[PDB]
Design a protein around this ligand. Structure first.
Ligand SMILES: [Cl-]
Ligand SMILES: [Cl-]
Ligand SMILES: [Cl-]
Ligand SMILES: [Cl-]
Ligand SMILES: [Cl-]
Ligand SMILES: [Cl-]
Ligand SMILES: [Cl-]
Ligand SMILES: [Cl-]
Ligand SMILES: [Cl-]
Ligand SMILES: [Cl-]
Ligand SMILES: [Mg+2]
Ligand SMILES: [Mg+2]
Ligand SMILES: [Mg+2]
Ligand SMILES: [Mg+2]
Ligand SMILES: [Mg+2]
Ligand SMILES: [Mg+2]
Ligand SMILES: [Mg+2]
Ligand SMILES: [Mg+2]
Ligand SMILES: [Mg+2]
Ligand SMILES: [Mg+2]
Ligand SMILES: [Mg+2]
Ligand SMILES: [Mg+2]
Ligand code: NA
Ligand code: NA
Ligand code: NA
Lengths: 287, 292, 289, 289, 290, 290
C-alpha cells in the first residue's frame, strides 16, 4: 500500500571516475517507474539530487546530507524510500535518513565488497569503500556524525552477502566484531535459499531492514556494467530468488540499488537486471 | 526404434524471428551423423514445405500455420503407425499443434513436458500480437480458434492434468489465470532454483506416472540466453545447459518419452551455432548418450 | 587564446528514450576538460542544464531546456567566450542557434549528421523534435520552437552545408531540392573525398561572419561511433572526421560548436565518448606533430 | 526508371565437401525485409519462393537444382521481368547463366567475389563445384554442367570482369593470363579506387546487349560481411560496394543479378543479410537524396 | 595447515601434436595475470625457475626431450623440500611432472581435473596426440620411452586416481575406466552430487596416499568461464565450483604438487583464462575470501 | 636469398603488455610454411632467450642483454648473405636489429612504420620504457650502453629515416623531429596524399641508401584491423593500405632487412593480428593476388 519514493544519486567520486553517476539514468531507461506503476504501486520519482587523503570529502558530505534529508522526509510521510546509485558511498546518506526511525535497524549488504575501510585500511582513500564502517560509527567524524547521531547501525544487525574482496583491516574487523558474513564460499556450500533463510533468522528481532544492493554483488557475466567488477559472483537466478524471498518475508522497509555503470555494460543488461530485481523485491512473481 | 526426423522451417506471426532456419542449423551441427553413431537407424524425412503468403490480420498467418500443421500431423501420424520415434525440428512453437494432432490420438492419456520460458497458453483474447506460436498449448488443450483446435477431426488432444511446464518465466495475466483455474503443474524458474532440476524431474515422472505416452516439447528458449542465445524470443534467467543435459539423461533413464520436438532455434541471434549444437547435444542425451 | 565555455545538455526526449541524456557525462568521462586545459585553453565547465524527464513529443520539456540553453549560450558569446555544447538529443541545436545566430549578420552552419533533421510534424513519421531542429532554426515548424528567444528565422538556407547525410525522408528531400540547400550525402563524400568536401564547404560559407558546427556523432559510421541515439550504417570514418576537424581549425572559421547524440547504452567502453573528445581536440587545434 | 517487375528466386543450396551454412542465405536476406524495401521504392515484386534442393561433390544435386533454376530464370526473362536470384552457394550461377545467356547476343558478367571460381576438377584442391561456376559457364569443365539447357558456352571470356579477387589458385591465374580476362584484384581496387574500377568496367562491357551481376557477399571484407560461406581477409568495404551499385544503376546496364553465399552461422545479427538488401536497393536505384 | 614451503614455479611452453593449439603461450599468460606477485602478497616465498626450453606418435622426440628436462627440474625442487608448481603448455607435460614426483612417494594420489581422461594409447587415439595420453602413460600404459621416463614405471596406480570433470571419453578410455574400476566424476556425477560431496568423497578415497598431485587442465571448466583453452568442451565446471574445490583441497592439506595447463590466449578474452588460473592457484595455496 | 627468422619474446618496461607472445602467435599463423610455399629457403633460428629479473630505465640489464644477443645473431645472418626477418616482442628490439645491420651498409635507410615515433630519452619519457626510445638510441641519442651497442654509434642518420603512421608523439619527440628535419608521414599526411604517394615519395627520399630496414610495428595499423598490439592507438593505417605498401616495397627491391613487432595475443581476436603480420610479410617478400 505504501507509495514508492524514487531518489536518484548521480554520484561518481573517489580517486577517479568509474561511470556510476549514469546509474540512475540507465535504471530509469529500463522502465523502472512504468514497471512499478504496472504492479499497482503509487510511484513518485523525486528526481536526482544535484552532486558537485579522503577523495572529494566535501562533495560526498554535501550530497549525502541532501539524500539523508530527502529519505528522512519520505519515511516521515509513511512512504518507501528507493534510492538509485551512484557510488556506494550514498549508503551513508540513506542510512543517516533511515536508522533514527527504527529502534533496531537491520542491514543486508549485498555486495562483492565489505566497504568496511577507514583511511588507515584503504589502499585508495575512496569513501565508496567506507560506507558500512561509517554507518557502524567507524571513520571520519563528519561522515560518522551525519544528521547528528551515531552509530546508525550495530554490527550484530548486519548481514553481508556475496563478499569476495575484503582487505586485511576489513577481515580483522569482521572477525573481532563477530559480524555475519556470507562470502561466495558459504553461498556455494549452503545455496542461496539457505543463506536467505539464515539471514531472515538472524535479523528476526530487527524492527526494520534496509537492503543495500550493489549490482557488483552479481557475477560480471550477469552484471557487467558496474563500477568495480569482481569475478565469481552471485548469478541473476540466485539474486532473483533472494529478492522474491525478501518480499515474501515482508521485512524490507527501505532499499538502494547502486554502482550501475553504463561504460562497462552491454546494451543496459545491468540497468535491466536492477529493474527486474526491484520488481521481485516489491512482489512481482513469475506465476 | 528407428528415429524419424521431420523439419518444420516455419517462422510465422506478426513479425519474423529467424526460427525457420532452426532445422538447417540443427542439421549443420551433425544431428543425423550423431544419432547414427549412437547405433540408431535414422530416417531424415526432410523439411515440410511452408506456404508463403502476401504481406491487420487477427490470427497472424492463420492459413499457412493451419496448412503446415496439417502436413506435419499427417507425417507424424504415419511415423507412429510405423512404430518409429518422431523427432520434429522447429521452427516456431506453433508446430506443437501439428505434432500433438498427429500423436495424441495414438494414446489414451498422452503426457506433455513443456520445456519453455513461455507457457504458450494464449488465445486471441489474451494475446497482444495474434501470434499463433504463443497459443499451441492452449490449442492442444481444446481452447482457441476452431480450425486449430479441431485439427485432424478430434479435440482436445491433451488434458490439463497431463501437462508439466518446466522453465516458465514469461506468462501474461490470462495464462496465469488459466494455470491457477486448471490446476496445471508448472515449475517456474523460482521452483527450479528452490528444488533443483533432479527433484523437478523426479516429481515430473511421478506426476505423469499414469500416462501411456509422454511427448517432450523442448523450446531452446527454456535455456538461459547465455547457453542458448540463438532463439526466437530470448528471456533472461533460464535453465543452464548442465541442468538441461541432466534432465534429458534422467528422461532417457525413465524410458517414458515416446515423441519429441526441439524448436525455436534462431541462427540470427546465435554465436557460431552454439544453440544448434546445444540442441543436438540435448537430443543425444534424450536418446541415451552417456559421458561414461 | 579564447576561453572555452562547456555547457552540458542531458536531454533525451521524443517518442521513446534513446540514452543520449548520458552523453555529456560520457564525454566528460573521456577527460574533455583536462584535454582542453592541457592544450593551453582556459576552460569553464558551466555544468549541466537541468532537463525535465519524459503530437510534438515532450514539447514543454524541449522548449524549457532550450530556453535555458539559449540564454546561457548568449551570455558566453556576450563575454567573447567559445560556446562548446555537449548533447544530448539533436533538438538542443534549437537552443544553441537561438543563443548564437542573433550575434551574426550571416551565421553559417555545418550540419555534420547522418540525418538532415529538416522535418515538421507534417513530414515526421514520429513527431520527434530531435528530427526537426534544422527546419525549426530555418523558421519552419511549431511557432513556439521557431520563435524561441523572440526572433526568427535564426539561419538562412543558403548558409547551411549538410555533411554525411544518408537518412532523408521524402519531405526533407523535397525541401533540399526546392531551397537549393548544399548537401554532401555519403555518395558525394565517396566520390569527392573529405578533403574536397571541406575545401568546397569553406569556399561556399566564405561570406559568413560566423560558422556554427553542429556535429552529431551519428554522422560517423557505427563501427567508429557505435554509441549514438540512432545509428545509420555506411557513415564517415574516424580518420575522415579527424581530418575534417583539423581542416576546420586551420580555416579559423568555427565560432561555436555542439557535439551531440552520444549514447553510452550502445557504446563499447566509451569508444564514442573518447572519439567526441578527440574530434573536439582537433577542432580546437590539436595536431599529431 | 526500370518499369519492370522484379522476380525473386531463392536457391537454398549448400553442397560441396562440407556444408558452409549458405543454404540459409535466402531466408536471412528476406529476413532483412528485401521484398518490403523494393516495394517501398515503387517496384512491383513477386517472390517466386525457393527452388527445392534435394570426384565432383554432389554433382547430381547441383545439376538437378541448377536445371530447375535455369528453367525458372528462363520463364522470368520470357515474361520481360528482372530475375533477382538469392543464394546459396555460388554454383547457382551455372543455372542462372544457363537460363539467361541464350536471351542475349553478347551477355556481359560482373563477377564480384573474393574468388575467381575458375576451377575444374584438375585445378580444384577440393572438387567443390561452387569453386567452378565461372569456368563451367565459359564452357570449361564437366560435360553435364557445361551443357546445361543444351547449349555452350554461356559466356565468352572477353565479356567477363572479375572485381574483388584475392584468392586465385595457380590454375585460375594461368587461365586468366592466357585468356586475357579482365580482373580487378584488391590490389587494383587499392591503386585505382572503386569509382575508376566501375568506370573502366562500364567502358569495357559497353558492347554487351545485357549484363549479369553475380555478387558474392564474400567480395566484401569480413569486417563488413562476416556472414559468408568462405571469408577472405582484405576485401571491398561496404561504402565502396554501395557506390559501385549506385554507379551500376546509373549506367542502366544490369539486366539480371544474383546475391549469393550469405551464411548466418558466421554472421553478427544479420549484418550480412542486411548488407545484401542495402546493395540490392542501391542497384535498383535507391538514392540518399 | 600453513605450508611453510617455498613455491618453485616452472613454465613448460609446449604446444605439440598433429597441429598447434596455442597452449605454448599459457605460462606467459598466467604470469601476465601476476601469478608471482599474488603468491608473494599471500606471504609465500616464490622462486620463478623460468621456462624449460622446448626445442605416428606426433612430435615424440620433442615431447620426450621436454618432459626429460621437466622431470629433472621437478625432482630437484622436491629434493629441496620445495613445492613444484608447473605451468602449461599441453597436458603431455604431466608425463614429466609425475616422472619427477612419483618416485618421492610410496602412494602418490592424482586428482585429474579435466574435460578429458587423457587415457589414450596410439591404438585408441584418432590423432596420435601425446597430450591425449599422459594419464595412461603415467599408469604404465603406452609407448615404452614415455612410460619408462626417468627409468621407472609405472608412476601411479589406477586406484590412486580420481578424475573430476570428464565429458569427452572415447570407447577405449571408457572400457579401461570400467575394467580398472578407476574413480571418475563425470559432469553427470558433479550435477547429481554437487562439488562439495565430490571433493569430500575424493579426500576420503585418497586418504591412504602419502602425497597428492593436482593436474588441473583449465579445459575442465566450462568454456563460458575458461574460453582460452587448447580444446574447449561444452558443459564444464563453473569458476565458482572450481574455486570452492581449490579452497577445500587447501583445507585438507593433502596437495603436495600441482600443474595448471592448457591455457590458450588464441581463444581467450582479455586473459580471462590466465586470470582464472591465477585465482585457482591462490585458492589452492590458501587464499581465503575472509 | 635465404630468409632467417629470429624471434624476440621480449615484454619489458614499466608493465608487461603481452608482446613476448608475438613470435609464437605469428608462427601460429603459419609464417614458415607460407614463406616456404612462395619458393624461399627458410631457416627458423628460433627464439632468443630473454633474461628474467624503481629503476629509471625499466629492465635495462635485460633489454641490453637481449639486444646484444640479437645484434650478434643478425650480424651472423648478414655475414652469410641471408635476409634477417625479426619477430617481436617490444619495439626496443630495433636497437639490437639495427646494431647488427647498420655496420654492413654505407648509408642504411629505415622505414619506421608505427603509431609512435619511439624517439624518447629518459628526460622526455614519462615511463622510462626503452621500447619508446629505440629510434633515438639508433640515432645515437640516449643511454650510453644502448647507444654504443656493438661498439659503434650512431647506427643511422636522421636524413635516412622515414616515419609512416605517426599519431602519438610527445613534445620532446615533436621538437626533435622539427629541429632534425626528419621525414614524418602522420595519419594527416597519409589521409591527404594517399598511401600510393606516401610510398612513392619515401622510395624517392631514400634512393641514395645502399640498404633499407623496415621496422613495422603492427600498432601502425588501426586497432579495428590489428587489435592485438601492445599499445593500440585509434585512427591508424588500414590493412589494405598496409598490404599495398608492402607490395610496393617488394616491387622497389630496396628492403634488405625487416622486423614485425608488438603483436599482443591478449588483446587479439582469434589471432587476427598474427595472421595480418604473416600476410604483410608475404606481400613484402613478393606474394601477389594474381
Ligand atoms: Cl515460414
Ligand atoms: Cl483464439
Ligand atoms: Cl509445482
Ligand atoms: Cl526473469
Ligand atoms: Cl555436435
Ligand atoms: Cl571438371
Ligand atoms: Cl601408444
Ligand atoms: Cl623479467
Ligand atoms: Cl636516456
Ligand atoms: Cl595466414
Ligand atoms: Mg559497495
Ligand atoms: Mg562493491
Ligand atoms: Mg514456446
Ligand atoms: Mg518460448
Ligand atoms: Mg541529428
Ligand atoms: Mg542524426
Ligand atoms: Mg564465389
Ligand atoms: Mg567467393
Ligand atoms: Mg588434458
Ligand atoms: Mg583436456
Ligand atoms: Mg614502436
Ligand atoms: Mg608503437
Ligand atoms: Na557497452
Ligand atoms: Na551470430
Ligand atoms: Na582474444
Amino acid at each position: 500500500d505504501k507509495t514508492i519514493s524514487v531518489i536518484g544519486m548521480p554520484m561518481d567520486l573517489g580517486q577517479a571516475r568509474r561511470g556510476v553517476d549514469m546509474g540512475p539514468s540507465a535504471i530509469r531507461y529500463a522502465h523502472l517507474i512504468e514497471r512499478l506503476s504496472d504492479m499497482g504501486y503509487t510511484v513518485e520519482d523525486l528526481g536526482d539530487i544535484p552532486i558537485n587523503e579522503l577523495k572529494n570529502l566535501n562533495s560526498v558530505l554535501a550530497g549525502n546530507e541532501k539524500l539523508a534529508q530527502k529519505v528522512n522526509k519520505v519515511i516521515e510521510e509513511k512512504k518507501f524510500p528507493l534510492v538509485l546509485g551512484g557510488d556506494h558511498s550514498i549508503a551513508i546518506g540513506t542510512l543517516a535518513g533511515t536508522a533514527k526511525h527504527y529502534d533496531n535497524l537491520g542491514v543486508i549488504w549485498y555486495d562483492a565488497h565489505g566497504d568496511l575501510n577507514t583511511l588507515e585500511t584503504s589502499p585508495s582513500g575512496n569513501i565508496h569503500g567506507m560506507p558500512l564502517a561509517v554507518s557502524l560509527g567507524i571513520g571520519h567524524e563528519s561522515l560518522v556524525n551525519l544528521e547528528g547521531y551515531a552509530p546508525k547501525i550495530k554490527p550484530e544487525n548486519v548481514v553481508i552477502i556475496g563478499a569476495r574482496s575484503l582487505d586485511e583491516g576489513e577481515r580483522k574487523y569482521i572477525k573481532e566484531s563477530g559480524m555475519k558474513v556470507y562470502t561466495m564460499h558459504e553461498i556455494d556450500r549452503l545455496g542461496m535459499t539457505k543463506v536467505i533463510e539464515e539471514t531472515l533468522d538472524y535479523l528476526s528481532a530487527c524492527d526494520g531492514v534496509h537492503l543495500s544492493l550493489d549490482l557488483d554483488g552479481l557475477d560480471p557475466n550477469d552484471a557487467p556494467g558496474v563500477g568495480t567488477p569482481v569475478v565469481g559472483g552471485i548469478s541473476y537466478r540466485e539474486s532473483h530468488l533472494a529478492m522474491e524471498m525478501l518480499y515474501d518475508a515482508g521485512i524490507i522497509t527501505s532499499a538502494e540499488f547502486v554502482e550501475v555503470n553504463p561504460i562497462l555494460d552491454h546494451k543496459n543488461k545491468t540497468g535491466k537486471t536492477a529493474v527486474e530485481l526491484v520488481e521481485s523485491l516489491l512482489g512481482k512473481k513469475l506465476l
